[PDB]
Short mmCIF file of N, CA and C in Angstrom, two decimals:
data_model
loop_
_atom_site.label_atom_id
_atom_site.label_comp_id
_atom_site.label_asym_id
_atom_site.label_seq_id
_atom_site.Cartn_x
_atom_site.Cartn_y
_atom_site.Cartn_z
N UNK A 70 -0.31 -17.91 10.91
CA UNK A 70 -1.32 -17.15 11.63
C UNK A 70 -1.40 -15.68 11.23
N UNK A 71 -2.44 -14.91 12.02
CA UNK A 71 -3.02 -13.62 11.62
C UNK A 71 -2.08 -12.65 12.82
N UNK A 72 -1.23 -13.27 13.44
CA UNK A 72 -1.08 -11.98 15.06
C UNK A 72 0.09 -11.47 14.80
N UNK A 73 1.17 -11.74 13.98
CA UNK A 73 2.39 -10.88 14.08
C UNK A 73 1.54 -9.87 12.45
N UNK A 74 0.67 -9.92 12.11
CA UNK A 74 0.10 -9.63 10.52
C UNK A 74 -0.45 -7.97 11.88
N UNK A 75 -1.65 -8.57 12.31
CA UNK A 75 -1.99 -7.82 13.71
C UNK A 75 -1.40 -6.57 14.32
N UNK A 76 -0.45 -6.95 14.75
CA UNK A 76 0.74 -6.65 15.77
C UNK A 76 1.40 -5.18 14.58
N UNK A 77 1.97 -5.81 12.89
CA UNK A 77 2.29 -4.68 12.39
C UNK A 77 1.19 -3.55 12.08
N UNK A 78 0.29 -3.97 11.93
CA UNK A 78 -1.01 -2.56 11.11
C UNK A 78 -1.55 -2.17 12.69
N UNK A 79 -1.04 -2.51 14.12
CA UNK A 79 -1.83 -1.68 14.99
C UNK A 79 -1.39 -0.18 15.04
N UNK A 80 -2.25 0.75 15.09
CA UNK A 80 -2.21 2.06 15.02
C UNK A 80 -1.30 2.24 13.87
N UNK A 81 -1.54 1.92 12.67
CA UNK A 81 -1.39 2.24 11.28
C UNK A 81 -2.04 3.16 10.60
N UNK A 82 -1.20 3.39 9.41
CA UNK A 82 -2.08 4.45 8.32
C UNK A 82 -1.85 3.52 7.49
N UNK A 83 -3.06 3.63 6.36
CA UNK A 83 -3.12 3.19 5.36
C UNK A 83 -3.66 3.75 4.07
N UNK A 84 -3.13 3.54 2.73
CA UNK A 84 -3.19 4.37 1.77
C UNK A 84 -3.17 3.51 0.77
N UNK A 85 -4.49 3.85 -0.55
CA UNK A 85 -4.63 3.11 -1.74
C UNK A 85 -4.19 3.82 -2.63
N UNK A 86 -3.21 2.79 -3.53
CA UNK A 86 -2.51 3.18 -4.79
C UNK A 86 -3.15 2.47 -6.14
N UNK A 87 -2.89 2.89 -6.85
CA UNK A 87 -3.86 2.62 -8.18
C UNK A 87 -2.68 2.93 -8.66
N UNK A 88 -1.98 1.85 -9.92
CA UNK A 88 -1.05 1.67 -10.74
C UNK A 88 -1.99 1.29 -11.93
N UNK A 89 -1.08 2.10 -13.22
CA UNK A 89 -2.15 2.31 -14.28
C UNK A 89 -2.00 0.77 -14.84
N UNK A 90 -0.77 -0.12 -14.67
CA UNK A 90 -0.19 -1.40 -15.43
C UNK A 90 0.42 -2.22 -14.13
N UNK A 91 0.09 -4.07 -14.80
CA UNK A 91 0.44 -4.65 -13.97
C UNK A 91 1.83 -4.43 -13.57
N UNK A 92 3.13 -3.89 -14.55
CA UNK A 92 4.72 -3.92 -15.13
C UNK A 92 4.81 -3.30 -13.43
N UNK A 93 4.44 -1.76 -13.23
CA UNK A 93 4.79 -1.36 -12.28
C UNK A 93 4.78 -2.33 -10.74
N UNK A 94 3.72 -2.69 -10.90
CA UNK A 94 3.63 -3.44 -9.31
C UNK A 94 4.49 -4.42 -9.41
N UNK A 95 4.41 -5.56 -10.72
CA UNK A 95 5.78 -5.96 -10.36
C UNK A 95 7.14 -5.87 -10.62
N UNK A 96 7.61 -4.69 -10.56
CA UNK A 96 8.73 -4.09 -10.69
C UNK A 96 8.83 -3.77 -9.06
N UNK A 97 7.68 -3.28 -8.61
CA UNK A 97 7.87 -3.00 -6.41
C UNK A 97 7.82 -4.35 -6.16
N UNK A 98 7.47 -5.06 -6.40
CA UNK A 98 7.17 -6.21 -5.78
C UNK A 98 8.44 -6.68 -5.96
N UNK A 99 9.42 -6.84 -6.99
CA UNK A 99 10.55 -7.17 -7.21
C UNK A 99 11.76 -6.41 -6.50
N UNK A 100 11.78 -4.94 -6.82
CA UNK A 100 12.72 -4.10 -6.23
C UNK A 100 12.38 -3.93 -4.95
N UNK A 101 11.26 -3.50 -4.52
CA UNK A 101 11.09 -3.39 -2.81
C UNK A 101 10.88 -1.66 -2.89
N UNK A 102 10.06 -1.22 -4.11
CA UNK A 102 10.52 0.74 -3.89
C UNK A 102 9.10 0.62 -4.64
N UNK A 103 8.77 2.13 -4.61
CA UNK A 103 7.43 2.38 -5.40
C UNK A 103 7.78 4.33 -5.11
N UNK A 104 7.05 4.66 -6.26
CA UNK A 104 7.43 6.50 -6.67
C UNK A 104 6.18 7.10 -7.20
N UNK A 105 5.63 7.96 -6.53
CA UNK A 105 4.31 8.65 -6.66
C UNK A 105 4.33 10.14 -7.37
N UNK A 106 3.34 10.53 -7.43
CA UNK A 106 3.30 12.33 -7.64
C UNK A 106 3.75 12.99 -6.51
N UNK A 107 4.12 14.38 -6.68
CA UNK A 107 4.27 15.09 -5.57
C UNK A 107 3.79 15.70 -4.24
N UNK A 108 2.54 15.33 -5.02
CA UNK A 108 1.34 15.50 -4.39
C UNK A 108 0.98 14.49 -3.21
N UNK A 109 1.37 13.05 -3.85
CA UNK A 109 1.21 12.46 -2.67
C UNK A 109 2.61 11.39 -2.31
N UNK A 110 3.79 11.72 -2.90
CA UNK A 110 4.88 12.16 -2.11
C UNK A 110 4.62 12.90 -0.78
N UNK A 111 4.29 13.79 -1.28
CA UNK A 111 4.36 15.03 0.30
C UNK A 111 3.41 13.90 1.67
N UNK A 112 2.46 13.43 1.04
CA UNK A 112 1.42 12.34 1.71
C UNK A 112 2.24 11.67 2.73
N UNK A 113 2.43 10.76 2.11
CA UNK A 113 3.56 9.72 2.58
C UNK A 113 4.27 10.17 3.55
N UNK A 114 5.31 10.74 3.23
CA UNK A 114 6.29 11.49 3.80
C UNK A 114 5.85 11.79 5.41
N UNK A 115 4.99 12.50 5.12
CA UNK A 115 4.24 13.34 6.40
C UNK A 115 3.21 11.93 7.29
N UNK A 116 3.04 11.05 6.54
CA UNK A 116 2.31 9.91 7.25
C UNK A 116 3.74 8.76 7.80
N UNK A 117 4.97 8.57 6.88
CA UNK A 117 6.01 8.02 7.43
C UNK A 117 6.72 8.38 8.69
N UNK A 118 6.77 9.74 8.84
CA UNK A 118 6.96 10.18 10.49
C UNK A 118 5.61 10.26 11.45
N UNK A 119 4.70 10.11 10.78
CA UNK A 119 3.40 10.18 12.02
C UNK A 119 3.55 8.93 12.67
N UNK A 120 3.62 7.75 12.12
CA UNK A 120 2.60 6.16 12.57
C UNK A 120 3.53 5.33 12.60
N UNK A 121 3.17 4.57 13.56
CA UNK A 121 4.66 3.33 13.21
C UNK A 121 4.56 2.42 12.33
N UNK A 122 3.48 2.19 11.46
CA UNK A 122 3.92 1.45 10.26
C UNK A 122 2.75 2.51 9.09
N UNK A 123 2.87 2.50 7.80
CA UNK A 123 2.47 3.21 6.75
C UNK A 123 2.47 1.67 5.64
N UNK A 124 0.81 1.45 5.49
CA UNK A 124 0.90 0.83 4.44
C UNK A 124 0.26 1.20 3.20
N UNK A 125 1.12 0.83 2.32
CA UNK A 125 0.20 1.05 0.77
C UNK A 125 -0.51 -0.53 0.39
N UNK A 126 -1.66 -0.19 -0.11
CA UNK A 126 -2.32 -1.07 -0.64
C UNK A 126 -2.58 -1.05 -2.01
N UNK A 127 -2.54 -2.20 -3.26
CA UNK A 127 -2.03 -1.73 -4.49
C UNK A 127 -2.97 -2.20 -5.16
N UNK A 128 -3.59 -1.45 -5.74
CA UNK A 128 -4.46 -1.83 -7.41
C UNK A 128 -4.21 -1.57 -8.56
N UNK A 129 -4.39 -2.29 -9.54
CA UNK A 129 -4.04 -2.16 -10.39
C UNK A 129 -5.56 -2.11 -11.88
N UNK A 130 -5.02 -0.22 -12.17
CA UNK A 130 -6.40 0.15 -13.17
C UNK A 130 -7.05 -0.95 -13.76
N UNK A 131 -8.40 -1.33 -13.63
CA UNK A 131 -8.95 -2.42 -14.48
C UNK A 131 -9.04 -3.48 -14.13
N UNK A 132 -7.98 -3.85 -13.20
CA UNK A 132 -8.11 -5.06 -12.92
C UNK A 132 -8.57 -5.91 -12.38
N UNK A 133 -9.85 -5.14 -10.96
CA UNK A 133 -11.00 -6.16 -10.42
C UNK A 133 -9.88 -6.34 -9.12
N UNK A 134 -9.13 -6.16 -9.13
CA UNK A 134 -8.13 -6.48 -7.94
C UNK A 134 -7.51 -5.39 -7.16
N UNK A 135 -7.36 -6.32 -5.73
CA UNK A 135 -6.02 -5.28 -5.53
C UNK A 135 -4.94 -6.97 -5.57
N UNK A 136 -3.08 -6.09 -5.28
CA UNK A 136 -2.32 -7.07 -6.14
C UNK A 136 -1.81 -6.92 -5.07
N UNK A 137 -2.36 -6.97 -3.57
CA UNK A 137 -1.07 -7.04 -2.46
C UNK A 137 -1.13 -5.92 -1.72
N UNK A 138 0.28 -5.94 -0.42
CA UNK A 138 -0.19 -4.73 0.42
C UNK A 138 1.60 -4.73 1.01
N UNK A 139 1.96 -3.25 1.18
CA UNK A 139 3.08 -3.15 1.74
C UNK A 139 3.73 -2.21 2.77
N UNK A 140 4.56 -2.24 3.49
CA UNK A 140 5.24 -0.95 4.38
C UNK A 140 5.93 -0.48 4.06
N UNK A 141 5.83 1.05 4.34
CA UNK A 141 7.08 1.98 3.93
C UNK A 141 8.11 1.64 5.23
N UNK A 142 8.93 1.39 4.70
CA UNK A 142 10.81 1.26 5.37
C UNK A 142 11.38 2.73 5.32
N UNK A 143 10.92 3.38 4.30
CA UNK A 143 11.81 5.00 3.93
C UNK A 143 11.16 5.97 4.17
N UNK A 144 11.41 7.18 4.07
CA UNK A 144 10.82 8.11 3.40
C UNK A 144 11.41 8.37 1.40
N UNK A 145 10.59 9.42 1.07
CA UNK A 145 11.06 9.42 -0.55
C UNK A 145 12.81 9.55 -0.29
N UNK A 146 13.53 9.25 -1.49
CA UNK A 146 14.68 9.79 -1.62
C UNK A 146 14.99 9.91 -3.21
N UNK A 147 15.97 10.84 -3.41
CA UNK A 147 16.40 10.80 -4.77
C UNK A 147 17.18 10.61 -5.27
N UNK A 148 17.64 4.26 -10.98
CA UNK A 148 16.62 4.79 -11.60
C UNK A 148 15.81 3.65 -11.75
N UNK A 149 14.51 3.82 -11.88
CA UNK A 149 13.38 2.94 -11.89
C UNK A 149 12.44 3.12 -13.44
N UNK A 150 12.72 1.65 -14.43
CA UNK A 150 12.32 1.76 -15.52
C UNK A 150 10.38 1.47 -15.46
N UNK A 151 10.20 1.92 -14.84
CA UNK A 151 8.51 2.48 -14.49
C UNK A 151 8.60 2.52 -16.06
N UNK A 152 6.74 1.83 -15.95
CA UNK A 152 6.29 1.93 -17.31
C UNK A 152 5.51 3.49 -17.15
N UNK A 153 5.88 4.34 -17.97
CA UNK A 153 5.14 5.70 -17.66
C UNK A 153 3.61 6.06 -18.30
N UNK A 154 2.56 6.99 -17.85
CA UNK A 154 1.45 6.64 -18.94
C UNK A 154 1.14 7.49 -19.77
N UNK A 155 3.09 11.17 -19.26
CA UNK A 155 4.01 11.46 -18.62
C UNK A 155 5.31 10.97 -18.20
N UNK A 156 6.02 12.34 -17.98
CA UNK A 156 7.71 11.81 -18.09
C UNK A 156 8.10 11.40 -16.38
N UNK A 157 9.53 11.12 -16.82
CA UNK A 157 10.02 10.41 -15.23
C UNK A 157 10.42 11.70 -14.68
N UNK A 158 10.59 12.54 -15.19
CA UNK A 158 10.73 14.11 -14.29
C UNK A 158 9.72 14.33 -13.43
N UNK A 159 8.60 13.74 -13.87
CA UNK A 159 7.26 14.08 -13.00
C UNK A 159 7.29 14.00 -11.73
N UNK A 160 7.96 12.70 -11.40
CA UNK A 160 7.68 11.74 -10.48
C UNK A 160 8.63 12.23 -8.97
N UNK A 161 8.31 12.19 -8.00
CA UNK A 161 8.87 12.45 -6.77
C UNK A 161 9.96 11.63 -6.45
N UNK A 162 10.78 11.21 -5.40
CA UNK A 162 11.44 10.67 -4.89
C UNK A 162 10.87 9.11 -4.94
N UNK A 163 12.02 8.07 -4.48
CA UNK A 163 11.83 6.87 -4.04
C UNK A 163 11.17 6.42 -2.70
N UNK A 164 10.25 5.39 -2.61
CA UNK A 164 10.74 5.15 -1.57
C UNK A 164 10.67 4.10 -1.32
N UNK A 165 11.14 3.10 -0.45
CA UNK A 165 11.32 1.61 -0.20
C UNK A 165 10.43 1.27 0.66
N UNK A 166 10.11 -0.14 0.16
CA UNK A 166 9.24 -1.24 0.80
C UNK A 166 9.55 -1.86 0.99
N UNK A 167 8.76 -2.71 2.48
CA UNK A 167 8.95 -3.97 2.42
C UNK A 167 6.95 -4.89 2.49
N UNK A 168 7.34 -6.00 1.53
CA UNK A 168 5.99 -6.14 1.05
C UNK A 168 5.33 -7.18 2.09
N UNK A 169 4.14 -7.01 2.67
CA UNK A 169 3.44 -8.04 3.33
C UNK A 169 3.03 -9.12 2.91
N UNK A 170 1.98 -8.36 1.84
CA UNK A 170 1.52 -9.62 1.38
C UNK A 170 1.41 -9.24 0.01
N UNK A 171 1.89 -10.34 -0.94
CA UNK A 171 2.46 -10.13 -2.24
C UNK A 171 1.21 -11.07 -3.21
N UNK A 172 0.43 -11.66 -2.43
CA UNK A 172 -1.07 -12.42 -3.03
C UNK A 172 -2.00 -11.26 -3.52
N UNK A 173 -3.20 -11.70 -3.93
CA UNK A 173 -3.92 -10.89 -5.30
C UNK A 173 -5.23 -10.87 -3.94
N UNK A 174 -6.58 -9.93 -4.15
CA UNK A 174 -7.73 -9.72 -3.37
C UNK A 174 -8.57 -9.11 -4.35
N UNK A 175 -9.79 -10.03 -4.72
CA UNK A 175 -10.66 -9.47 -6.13
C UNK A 175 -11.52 -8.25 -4.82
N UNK A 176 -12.04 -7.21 -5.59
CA UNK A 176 -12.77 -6.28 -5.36
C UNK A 176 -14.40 -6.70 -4.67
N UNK A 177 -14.76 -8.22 -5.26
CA UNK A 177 -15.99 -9.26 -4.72
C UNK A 177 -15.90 -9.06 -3.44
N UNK A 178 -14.36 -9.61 -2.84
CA UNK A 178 -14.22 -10.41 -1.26
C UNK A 178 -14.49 -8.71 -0.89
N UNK A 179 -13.55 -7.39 -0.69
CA UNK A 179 -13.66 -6.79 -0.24
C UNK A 179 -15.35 -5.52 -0.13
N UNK A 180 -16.37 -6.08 -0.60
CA UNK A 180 -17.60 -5.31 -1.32
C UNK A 180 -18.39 -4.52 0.32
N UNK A 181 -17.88 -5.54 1.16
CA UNK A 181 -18.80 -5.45 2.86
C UNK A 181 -17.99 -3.99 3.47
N UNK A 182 -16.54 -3.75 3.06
CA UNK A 182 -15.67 -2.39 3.52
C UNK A 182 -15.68 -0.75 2.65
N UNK A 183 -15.92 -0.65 3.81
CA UNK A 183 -16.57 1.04 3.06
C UNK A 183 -15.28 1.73 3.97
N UNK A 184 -15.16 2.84 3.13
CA UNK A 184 -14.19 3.80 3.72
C UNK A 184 -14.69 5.19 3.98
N UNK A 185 -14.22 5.74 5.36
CA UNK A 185 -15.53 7.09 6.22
C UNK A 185 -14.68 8.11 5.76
N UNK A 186 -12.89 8.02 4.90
CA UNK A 186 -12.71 9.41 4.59
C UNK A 186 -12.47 9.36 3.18
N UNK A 187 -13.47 8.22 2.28
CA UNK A 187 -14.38 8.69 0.84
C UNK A 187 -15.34 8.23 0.83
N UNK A 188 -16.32 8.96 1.63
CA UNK A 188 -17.66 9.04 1.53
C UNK A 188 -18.32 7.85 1.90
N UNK A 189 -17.86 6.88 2.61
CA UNK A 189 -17.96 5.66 3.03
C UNK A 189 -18.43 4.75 1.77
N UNK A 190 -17.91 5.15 0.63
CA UNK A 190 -17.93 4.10 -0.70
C UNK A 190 -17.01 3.02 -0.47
N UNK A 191 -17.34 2.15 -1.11
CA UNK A 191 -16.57 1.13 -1.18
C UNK A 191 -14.59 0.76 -0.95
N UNK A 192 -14.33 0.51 -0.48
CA UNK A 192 -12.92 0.57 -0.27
C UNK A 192 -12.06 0.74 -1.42
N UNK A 193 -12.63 -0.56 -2.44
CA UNK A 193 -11.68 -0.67 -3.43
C UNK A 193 -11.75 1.18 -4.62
N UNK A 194 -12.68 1.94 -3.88
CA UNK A 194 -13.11 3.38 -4.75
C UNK A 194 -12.57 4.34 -4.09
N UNK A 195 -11.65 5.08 -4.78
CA UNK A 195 -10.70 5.86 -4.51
C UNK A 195 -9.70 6.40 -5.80
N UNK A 196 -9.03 7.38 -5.49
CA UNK A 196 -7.73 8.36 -6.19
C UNK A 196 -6.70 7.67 -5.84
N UNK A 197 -5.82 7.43 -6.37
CA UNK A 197 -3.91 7.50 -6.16
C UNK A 197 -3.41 7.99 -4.91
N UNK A 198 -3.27 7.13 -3.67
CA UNK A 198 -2.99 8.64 -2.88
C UNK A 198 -4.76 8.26 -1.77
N UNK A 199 -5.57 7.86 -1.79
CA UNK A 199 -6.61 8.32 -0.72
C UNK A 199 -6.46 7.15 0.27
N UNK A 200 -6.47 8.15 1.15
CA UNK A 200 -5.88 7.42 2.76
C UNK A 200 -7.27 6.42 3.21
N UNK A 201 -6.96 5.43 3.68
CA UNK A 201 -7.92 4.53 4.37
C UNK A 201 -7.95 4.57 5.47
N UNK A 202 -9.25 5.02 5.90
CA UNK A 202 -9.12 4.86 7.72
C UNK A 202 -8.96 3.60 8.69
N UNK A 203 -8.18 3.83 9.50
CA UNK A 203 -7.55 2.47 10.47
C UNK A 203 -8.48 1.28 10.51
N UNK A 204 -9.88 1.59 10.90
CA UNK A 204 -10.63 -0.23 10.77
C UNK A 204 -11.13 -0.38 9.64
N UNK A 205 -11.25 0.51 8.47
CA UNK A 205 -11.47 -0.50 6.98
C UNK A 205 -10.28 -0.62 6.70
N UNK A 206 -9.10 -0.44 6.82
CA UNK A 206 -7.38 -0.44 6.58
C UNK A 206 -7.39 -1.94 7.00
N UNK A 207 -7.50 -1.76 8.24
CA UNK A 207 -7.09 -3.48 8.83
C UNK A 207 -7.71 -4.36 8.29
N UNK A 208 -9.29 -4.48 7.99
CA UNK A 208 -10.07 -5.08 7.90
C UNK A 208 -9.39 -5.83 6.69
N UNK A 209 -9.64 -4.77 5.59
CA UNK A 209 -8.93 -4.96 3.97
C UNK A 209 -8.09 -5.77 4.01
N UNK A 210 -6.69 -5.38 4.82
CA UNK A 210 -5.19 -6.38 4.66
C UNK A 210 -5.70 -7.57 5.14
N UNK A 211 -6.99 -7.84 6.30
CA UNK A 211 -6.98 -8.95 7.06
C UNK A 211 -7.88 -9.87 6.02
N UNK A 212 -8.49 -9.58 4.97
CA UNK A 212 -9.19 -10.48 3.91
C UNK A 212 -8.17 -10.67 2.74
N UNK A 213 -6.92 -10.44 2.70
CA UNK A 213 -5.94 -11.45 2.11
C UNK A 213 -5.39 -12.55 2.04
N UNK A 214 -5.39 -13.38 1.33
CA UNK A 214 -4.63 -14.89 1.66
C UNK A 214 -3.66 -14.71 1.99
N UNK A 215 -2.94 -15.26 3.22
CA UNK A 215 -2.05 -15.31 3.99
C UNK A 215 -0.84 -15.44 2.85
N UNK A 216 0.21 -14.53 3.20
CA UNK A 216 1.62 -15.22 1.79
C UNK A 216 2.55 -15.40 2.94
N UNK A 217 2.52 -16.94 2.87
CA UNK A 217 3.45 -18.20 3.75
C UNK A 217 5.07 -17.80 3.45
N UNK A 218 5.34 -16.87 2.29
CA UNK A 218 6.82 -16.47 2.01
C UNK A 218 6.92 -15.28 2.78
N UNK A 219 6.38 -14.76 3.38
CA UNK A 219 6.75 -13.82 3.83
C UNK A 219 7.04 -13.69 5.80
N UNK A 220 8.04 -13.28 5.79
CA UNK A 220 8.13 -13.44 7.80
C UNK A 220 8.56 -12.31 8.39
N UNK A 221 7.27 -11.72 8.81
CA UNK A 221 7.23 -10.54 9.15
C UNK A 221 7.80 -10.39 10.63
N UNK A 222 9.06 -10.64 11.27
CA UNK A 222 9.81 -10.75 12.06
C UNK A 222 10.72 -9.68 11.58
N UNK A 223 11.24 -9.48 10.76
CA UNK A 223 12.31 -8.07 10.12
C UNK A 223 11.72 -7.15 9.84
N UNK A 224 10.06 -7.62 9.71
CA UNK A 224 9.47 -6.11 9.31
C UNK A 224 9.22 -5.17 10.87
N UNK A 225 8.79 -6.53 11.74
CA UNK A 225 8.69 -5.83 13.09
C UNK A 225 9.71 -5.29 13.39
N UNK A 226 11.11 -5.59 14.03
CA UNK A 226 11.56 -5.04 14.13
C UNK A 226 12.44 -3.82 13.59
N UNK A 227 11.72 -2.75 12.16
CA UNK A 227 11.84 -1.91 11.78
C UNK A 227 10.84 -1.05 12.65
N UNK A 228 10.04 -1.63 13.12
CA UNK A 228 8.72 -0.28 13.45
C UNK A 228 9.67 -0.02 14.97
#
């Protein structure tokens, strides 16, 4: 079912990431961590103490997709063989995930969700880093195929 899925993104933030290569996502998807600019390091950070859950939602450049959706467990902290595109000095702190849903969402299904803090363009259109407001946020995660591996019972009780 859709209600413990529900239950985590109520009064959520949500935030789209754009990974330049598939390697990276599944390297988070594998390790459970993902590492941004500083810029939106600082993002995060400041959205991980606001909300009781913080999700990233992941695309990947080119690809017509997004590749899944996840919660921050951490804030950054301070090695990860990230495919780079710039050096690993660049890069901010860690921080850990735990992944919701680890299934794929072509850019087609999502075309009806517009987002009101970028210009109410299309969801999947956005920077590294641009926050999604709470009902195209939900909406988005809620047009994913359900991933039956995942039991979001440990994730609840982190929030």
């Amino acid at each position: 079912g859709t209600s413990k899925l529900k239950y985590v993104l109520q009064d959520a933030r949500f935030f789209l990431i754009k990974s330049n290569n598939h390697e990276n996502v599944s390297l988070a998807k594998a390790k459970g961590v993902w590492s941004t600019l500083p810029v939106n390091e600082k993002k995060l950070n400041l959205a991980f103490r606001s909300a009781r859950s913080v999700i990233l939602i992941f695309s990947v450049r080119e690809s017509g997709k997004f590749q899944g959706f996840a919660r921050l467990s951490s804030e950054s902290h301070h090695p990860i063989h990230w495919v780079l595109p710039m050096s690993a000095k660049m890069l901010g702190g860690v921080f850990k995930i735990d992944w919701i849903c680890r299934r794929e969402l072509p850019f087609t299904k999502s075309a009806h969700l517009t987002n009101p803090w970028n210009e109410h363009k299309p969801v999947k259109i956005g920077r590294d880093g641009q926050e999604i407001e709470l009902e195209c946020g939900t909406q988005l995660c809620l047009l994913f195929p359900p991933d039956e591996s995942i039991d979001l019972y440990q994730v609840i009780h982190k929030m």
